[PDB]
């Protein structure tokens with residue numbers, strides 16, 4: 001894409017130790033599956049393209065970007081060592097939205113709907129075997 005967008009977050013690195021856990025399997029098969037297909041998912045399914053959206057200040061304000069497209073790749077490509085890393089990526093994505101946008105903007109209402117579902121699913125994250 002454009003040189004004026006930053007490179008996306010890392011999704012592949014052979015030097016980083018990887019593991020499959022039952023919790024990470026739940027994050028892919030239950031949590032991401034649930035949020036990905038939601039009516040309000042589409043703004044979150046890829047990195048924010050600040051050029052196409054005409055938001056030249058976006059990456060001046062958001063220095064820790066994350067999106068569900070990146071999380072999906074991280075889960076599908078077994079990038080994580082634990083569930084906490086992935087949960088943190090979801091929380092970063094929601095906080096980016098809340099920091100950049102005004103309360104009650106449509107995108108914030110959309111994030112809030114996804115977050116409510118996320119919270120319900122994380123409350124049922126299974127005990128690690």
Ligand SMILES: OCCn1cc(Br)cn1
Pocket residue numbers: 004005050051052054055056057
């Ligand atoms: O200011 C950073 C580069 N940039 C320009 C537009 Br439009 C979007 N990103």
